[PDB]
Design a binder for this molecule. Structure first.
Ligand SMILES: CC(=O)N[C@@H]1[C@@H](O[C@@H]2O[C@H](CO)[C@H](O)[C@H](O)[C@H]2O)[C@H](O)[C@@H](CO)O[C@H]1O
Ligand code: NA
Length: 619
């Protein structure tokens, strides 16, 4: 809503968040941001996947072997390059609107223009605690103490005060109309620049006909027609910009070759083609065996806007996807609400699937089951099901798979999840020998340049992969539903926790050049999580105002952990959560903490760690 955008930049000006809070000011900051990331970030993983995807494990080995803080000076004076290397207009606007809100939350001034900044008294914060007990329970139902959530409550109350100022300015509607008229022109200009950045099948919801041959002159009309095409190596399917595919879905079982991949994309002019699945695109998921915990749901119907079922040598690019529920009989937090995906990837009957790539997808309002962790449930979820006959087709798993440039907003439960496998019970040791990955695990997994925001559960998680590279991702405001207010009927599933960007049962994972802000309080709610897995390294990551702190080392199977050359600015709760972990080497980081935010997070402090040569500032 343009009046809310206008109001936000009015507050930004009064807070001094940005020097120029005109629409041109927004445009120049966007241009500056993209030019900076292009000049200063690493080049690896930019451009065609054929030029780098085979080198992911090699670049991971090189970066893990670094012996000093690369560009330490930039990192320490606040001009390092991290987060997504290109921000779309939609990513950038949402990022700045969140920046303004968080600046209000930490503002110490008396006034914002004529608005007197409320000073939240102990009485007022304690009253909020007593009235919102459903927000302060942990994994096992035990409450955080008031003292543990005092500063988080003040942050929340200042965010509400901020939000009330926006609707107030909106209510009070001259130069607002000027500001908004100019913003629309700038927005269109930005969309024009964004847009600038076998057989060809054309599909047009507006001009097509499913009886056509599917040329640009006589395009197909519907995704159902696409679902019926016998797509061959080299084929392209191009969806017309401006198209809306109402209640439609793409369910594909197609294979290109290395030499002639299949491409799904956009053509023409206007908005990204919109797949508006609205809870249709039904299919039956079955892992074929219980998962790592017997309580995890592992079979049932899923709604997916885009289902890639045993696909290979396929790239999907430049689409907008939603998957809203709200069908008759359904409530939002219902225990068995259908699992929903924006893009679901499945490996089952073709052994290793090669060369699946998602690029520049805008996936929002995917209203999956609030609870279920391992059904294909969230914005993007790739999994591996037990093959019909593994002795004939091989272990179902992934090789050379990338998720790049995707924007996720309001997806539940997961943001981006890649790799959960029916072979999960083969990895139930602390140490994970390389042979487990040679037989059962994924190779050359690359997740980069994504923006995940307002996510029900975890932001980005890579699973069962050898040396995955998760880099140059930006995350805001994940774990929104990991609390009793939304997580109403978990039954025996537990799982009321989420962290930002992290690996599960990976070997020698590298998470680097990521940015994570404003994780929503739960027992976890830290930015980074060296979870169960072997050899995880976080380096060159930026974290800010996460309500569960900076980094966790999670229990006895989180082994060979290292956390170096990271910057943490005003993480809350407690900076490090060494929770029952056997080791963690925490060294050569820079932390900025409030005096009343401890280095070690309460109740998550009984693990083994070496913290040395860290620079801890008070703020
Ligand atoms: C060991 C542990 O408790 N780790 C937590 C994570 O929970 C595990 O996540 C994996 C995901 O593949 C399985 O679901 C497993 O059964 C869970 O125990 C949890 O997701 C993260 C993020 O909050 O943190 C740990 O608490
Ligand atoms: Na294969």
């Amino acid at each position: 809503n343009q009046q809310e955008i206008y109001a936000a930049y009015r507050v930004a000006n009064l807070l001094g968040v940005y020097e120029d809070c005109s629409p041109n000011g927004f445009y120049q900051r966007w241009k500056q941001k993209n030019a900076f990331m292009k000049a200063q970030a690493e080049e690896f993983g930019i451009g065609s996947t054929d030029h780098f995807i085979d080198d992911v494990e090699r670049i991971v080995d090189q970066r893990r072997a670094e012996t000093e803080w690369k560009n330490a000076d930039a990192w320490k004076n606040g001009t390092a390059a991290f987060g997504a290397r290109y921000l779309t207009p939609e990513m950038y606007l949402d990022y700045e609107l969140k920046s303004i809100q968080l600046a209000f939350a930490t503002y110490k001034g008396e006034l914002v223009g004529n608005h007197k900044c409320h000073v939240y008294t102990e009485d007022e914060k304690r009253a909020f605690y007593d009235a919102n007990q459903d927000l302060f329970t942990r994994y096992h139902g035990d409450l955080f103490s008031y003292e543990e959530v005092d500063l988080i409550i003040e942050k929340w109350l200042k965010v509400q005060e901020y939000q009330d100022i926006i609707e107030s300015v909106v209510a009070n509607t001259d130069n607002a109309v000027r500001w908004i008229t100019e913003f629309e022109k700038i927005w269109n200009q930005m969309q024009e620049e964004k847009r600038l950045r076998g057989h060809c099948y054309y599909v047009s919801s507006i001009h097509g006909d499913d009886a056509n041959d599917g040329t640009e002159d006589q395009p197909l009309k519907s995704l159902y027609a696409v679902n019926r095409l016998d797509l061959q190596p080299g084929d392209q399917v191009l969806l017309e910009r401006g198209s809306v595919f109402e209640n439609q879905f793409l369910h594909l079982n197609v294979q290109g070759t290395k030499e002639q991949p299949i491409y799904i994309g956009a053509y023409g002019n206007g908005a990204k083609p919109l797949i508006q699945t609205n809870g249709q695109g039904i299919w039956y998921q079955d892992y074929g065996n219980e998962l790592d915990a017997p309580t995890h749901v592992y079979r049932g119907y899923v709604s997916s806007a885009v289902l890639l079922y045993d696909c290979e040598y396929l790239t999907v690019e430049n689409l907008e996807i939603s998957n809203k529920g709200g069908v008759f009989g359904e409530t939002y937090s219902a225990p068995h609400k259908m699992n929903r995906t924006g893009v679901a990837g499945i490996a089952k009957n073709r052994g290793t699937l090669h060369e699946i790539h998602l690029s520049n997808l805008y996936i929002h309002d995917v209203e999956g089951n609030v609870y279920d962790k391992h059904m294909n449930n969230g914005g993007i979820y790739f999994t591996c099901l037990k093959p019909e006959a593994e002795e004939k087709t091989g272990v179902a798993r992934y090789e050379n798979v990338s998720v790049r440039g995707c924007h996720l907003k309001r997806t539940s439960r997961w943001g981006i999840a890649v790799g959960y496998s029916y072979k999960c019970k083969e990895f139930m040791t602390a140490e994970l020998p390389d042979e487990l990955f040679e037989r059962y695990g994924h190779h050359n997994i690359y997740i980069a340049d994504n923006y995940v925001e307002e996510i029900g559960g975890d932001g980005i998680t890579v699973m069962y992969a050898m040396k995955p590279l998760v880099e140059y991702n930006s995350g805001d405001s994940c774990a929104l539903e990991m609390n009793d207010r939304y997580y109403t009927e978990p039954e025996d599933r537990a799982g009321k926790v989420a962290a930002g960007i992290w690996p599960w049962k990976c070997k020698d994972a590298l998470l680097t050049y990521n940015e994570m802000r404003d994780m929503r309080l739960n027992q976890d709610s830290m930015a980074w999580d060296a979870d169960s897995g072997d050899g995880t390294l976080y380096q060159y990551n930026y974290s800010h105002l996460n309500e569960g702190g900076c980094v966790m080392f999670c229990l006895e199977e989180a082994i060979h952990n290292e956390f170096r050359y990271n910057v943490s600015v005003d993480d809350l709760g407690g900076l490090i959560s060494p929770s029952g972990n056997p080791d963690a080497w925490i060294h050569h980081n820079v932390f900025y903490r409030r005096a009343e935010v401890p280095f070690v997070r309460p109740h998550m402090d009984d693990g083994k760690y070496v913290a040395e040569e860290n620079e801890i500032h008070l703020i």
